[PDB]
Symmetry: D2
Subunit: 337 residues, 4 copies
């Protein structure tokens, strides 16, 4: 209805990609960025070159303390304290909280105190903060809610898949495994992970298949109450720049042939979930989804059925890119709604 | 009872590792090797240096056309036709068929025609050749069977896991996913796979999560009839030198707590299956099993249960090393039995 | 002057990229492709998806035995014998010989017998076949020469660098080292390289720094006679999808400051060699050049000088992309000249 | 003369490996370890499992706040302030300063204040702290010097190589390039490096060839005055667990054939520098030196000569393992001398 003004806290993989994903958009625009761990010179550099998604689609420069993207000026701050960021001065409608250390309503509030209208945590909340997944429950958003969560990359991939299958065949119970690409919280060589938590994530990322936990499957139950308590899963970190794959093993109430389930998913991908859920029958591999903007693409040939009620369903997702575009979709939605 | 004389056809990852794994052994010894794709000089080189398991634990040299391991002589041939290999002259009790292109009883017979007493296919058979898994059904071997199969690396990992769980809790149905390390049949850069079969395996192995199929789960039913038709699964090839991880999602007849299932497995690992099945509660990662000689090590902390009858069980395995030691165990067994 | 009709023999990394690089071009177009190791279905797949350069910028399909790129038809053959390819019927002005097994004038002749006007070997010749490097000696091409070589990726990178430095400061002698990205001739796991030649290239590409030889530096002397016998070097294969870096250590006749040499190169990159030689002072890394169409980009900050006559100069190059664009530049040139 | 008591500050790649390398030794033993970034439980874990060098050659456990290696007790501390570590109570003869943040005489002094007799910085000093390289100048050590530096992994590789070549042929000038394996100071995904220094090191380590600087070559001049000002070089970080390769391009005073230079090096490797400098003519690759305890192994076949005075010499080194063993050699030396 009118260009949404976005503010970004934490200019990392997600911060920068959300920024990159906004470039095309004509319904949203980033006007402010905050990150106390990079000078303006360092920030332009990081935004300009990317080891996964290529160089920035435009010229990046800075002048007088502003970030210059073509002929637009973006304010840049270096506040370690969110409450200290002049979001208000910049007329920020929504702040993309993507530092990964303010995942609670009390912590994410400081942005509102700084003048920001609303806030979106680019990760699962540690509080009972409302969680939303585009194309799944975003239409159940209440404008009075000023702080929300866009969930996790994995939840965004599994959620759509789960809804379609449950909606028609009904999911009795399911277990999920996601082979996930490398992430910023990992180490180059064997070392101690932060807070001595999840020791495995401190092991050399270059040569290991690394077991990790994830609440993505249980989170689905929060976005789809009908599924609360019917799903859970694990993760396996692998040495891949980007693109992860969800592997859902489920039991359905109503019997079906793999072909029928596949057909149902395809129908959703071309209809109501077009743009969120994708469908394919090609012999694809992770690299094929690098920079794919969908939340999840069903891989028909990769999955299979043991019998008429026990299935193994596979779906890919660019954990970085898809998620970043969704953050923008949610930002626009909760501002014009 | 008396040193088993082993012959190796196909001196590749498995051929060389079986050879390496025999070095310590005092009940078996390799006396002949055949591979028409490497001169003797090239063969010593490959056997001496290994990018995964380190250098050979002894000095490797050649003289007068023989392979010299210390002060032992090993005959070396370069026959493309198995029937042309003088196994008899070398008194070969068993031939480790590990070229991957003679996986049928008719094809593997040529070794018997060459003078070899018995043969073991280092891979699943394409015929109804008898399949054996150490510690699972090897005691059901019939001496009159001259050609057998040691199965696949994955089957050897999943089989023990399946038996213990089924034996006490009973497995109604199960689906499996194995994240597998890179393999010789893959390509360095995107290209056409052999015979235009399994296109995905021709995609760059360095940067892809590659979906692949596997009959390992169904094979379990062949080694454990009670499980025929109750298991199947898929694979995901990843960029790892060695070590794969089996991820079994199963439904049990009798309810149980994750702890009880874990306890049952541990009991087996320390008792009847000691040496085949391992157990651990440490925060491990793939690299931790490089060169582990067991067929499968249960990872207690990596798995979990959705409810009292739906479980996700994880077990690691060095696809190269463990399998190779098993080939030797089977070789000795079917020769002294 | 008029659209050049290109034929491609060997639809591999270079074949497909040359094809991809021609898509934009309005002065050249591919009308025929030959590769006996992929069915038409397999060929579309490989051309459509790429693990390095992304998906094809257009829809790829096939119908009635033709390759369909939008609404253009490209003939596709599967001849193992080059002389058997109907280049003439397709009016091929130039054939991009990129299979890597017909690098001699006698062998590359078969294309002329098939009806092709001229031929370009996408690699160094093993004969005294004429070698050309765009922007260096291509203007010394003789139209009566029907078979030529576009040289090697490394030569194309080093050649421009060498000319500029020699032209002004004069190179007395130089040694070069190129850290090269992985290549099709390498193996996923330790095995025997073809013909038992260059054993090192058969070692696991995923985890090794692999020493390899290269005539790229000596080749420079063939394209720049003034430098014959003044340069040579070695290579180091590393696990990188694409992008290699040339590292030239040279001694100049006339003294200079690193700044002056840098300035000279910059001058060439913005003047006479614009498009072939690039210049930069940014803190770049290999990934930054993925898909860069230049033959070599000088890295000012990466190099240095020991004294006024001994220098270490660094320059990057996308071994796949840049080279492929050059093949097109040469194809057009020798057809309209 | 009598078991040297070693203390380790910073239980990282080097800390743990020095500890691991001491296990066999009968002339030195670690009695204390300090690292405030890992609980005792976390420390045992990290010491027990290693993604590069395998599992610890003994059982690792902890009891009553001590590290238990078999039946030996090692005190463990978690002081962020070195001066606060009770080295004296533990009778520490030498402290292996390997945190990488106390590389100055003033900073490394705090250990002496804590009761430690002497100190060795496991890295190049930022002060004019004395630098020593085993087999090169360690016999010029003065017992009154309480703080010294064992130099850098690269210097330890290049130093021996340089001495032998200079001693007989004389090095006029030389430039060096080391392709180096990944290091702890690098990042898994593109991010900001510490202090905004060396931006390149913050780029994804998984997929980049990363240009880096190094004073290793100039440092050689400090250990070998005769070479001061005659050498310098650059580095290239690559995705390799461990093992780097030094590539020295040098000009000699006295002419020679590659064979003679190779012969000279071999002579040193088997004589005076045996154990420090290695020699080989095999087609080796980085993985072949994983866990090699030598400071540098000359690779005869990898190098070459342009003419009788201009050479390119290659030598490998396990940046982690060799260096760690050297730290122990120096520790014993300066305590019994
Ligand atoms: N990378 C993925 O695949 C992916 C996918 C979906 C969601 N996410 C995530 O989004 C979040 C961020 O992850 P990321 O990959 O972008 O990590 P990242 O480390 O690349 O980015 C985090 C940024 O936070 C900055 N920061 C730290 N403290 C700050 C402060 N006080 N104020 C402002 N900035 C601060 C850092 O300097 C950094 O640039 C995580 O919670 C994670 O769940 C990541
Ligand atoms: N690498 C693993 O992860 C793993 C684990 C368990 C089992 N296996 C396997 O065992 C088999 C062999 O695989 P690998 O990893 O050793 O592959 P590999 O490519 O390393 O070894 C195959 C060998 O076959 C040789 N060969 C080809 N044709 C021949 C012929 N006619 N006569 C004699 N030798 C011939 C080749 O030169 C090569 O040395 C496969 O079927 C596979 O299932 C592999
Ligand atoms: N990849 C690079 O970085 C790079 C850069 C510059 C030059 N080059 C090269 O150009 C050449 C090709 O290498 P590539 O990387 O494309 O390798 P590739 O293996 O990817 O492609 C070669 C193609 O040749 C085909 N082929 C084999 N025999 C054939 C025949 N008889 N007729 C028709 N096709 C046949 C194969 O099926 C394959 O598709 C090499 O000589 C190499 O020097 C490669
Ligand atoms: N990895 C190699 O290839 C190699 C080779 C030779 C030398 N070195 C080095 O030796 C040094 C250490 O590097 P590394 O690879 O072990 O890095 P690392 O990061 O693995 O280890 C450093 C340790 O310092 C600890 N630490 C931080 N602050 C501390 C404090 N105040 N007190 C005690 N401990 C503290 C960290 O927790 C960590 O365990 C570096 O300067 C580097 O040059 C590394």
């Amino acid at each position: 209805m009118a260009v949404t003004k976005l503010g970004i806290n934490g200019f990392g993989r997600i911060g920068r990609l959300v920024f990159r994903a906004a470039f095309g958009r004509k319904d949203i625009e980033v006007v402010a960025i905050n990150d106390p761990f990079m000078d303006l010179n360092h920030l332009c550099y990081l935004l300009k070159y990317d080891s996964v998604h290529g160089q920035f689609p435009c010229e990046v420069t800075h002048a007088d303390g502003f970030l210059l993207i073509g002929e637009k000026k973006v304010s840049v701050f270096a506040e370690k304290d969110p409450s200290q960021i002049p979001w208000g001065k910049c007329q920020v409608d929504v702040v993309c909280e993507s530092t990964g250390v303010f995942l609670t309503k009390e912590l994410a509030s400081s942005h509102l105190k700084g003048g920001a209208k609303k806030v979106i945590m680019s990760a699962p909340p540690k509080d009972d903060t409302p969680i939303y997944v585009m194309g799944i429950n975003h239409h159940q958003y209440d404008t009075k809610q000023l702080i929300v969560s866009n969930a996790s990359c994995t939840t965004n991939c599994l959620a759509p898949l789960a809804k379609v299958i449950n909606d028609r065949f009904g999911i009795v119970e399911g277990l999920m495994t996601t082979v996930h690409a490398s992430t910023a919280n990992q180490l180059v060589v064997d070392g101690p992970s932060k807070g001595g938590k999840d020791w495995r994530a401190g092991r050399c990322a270059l040569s290991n298949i690394i077991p990790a936990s994830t609440g993505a499957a249980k989170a689905v139950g929060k976005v789809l109450p009908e599924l609360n308590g019917k799903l859970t899963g694990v993760a396996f970190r692998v040495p891949i720049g980007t693109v992860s794959v969800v592997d859902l093993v489920c039991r359905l109430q109503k019997p079906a042939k793999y072909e029928e389930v596949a057909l149902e998913i395809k129908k959703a991908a071309e209809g109501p979930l077009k743009g969120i859920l994708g469908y394919t029958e090609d012999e694809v591999v992770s690299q094929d989804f690098v920079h794919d903007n969908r939340s999840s693409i069903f891989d028909m040939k990769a999955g299979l059925a043991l019998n008429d009620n026990f299935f193994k369903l596979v779906s890919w997702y660019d954990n970085e890119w898809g998620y970043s575009n969704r953050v923008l979709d949610l930002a626009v939605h909760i501002t014009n709604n």
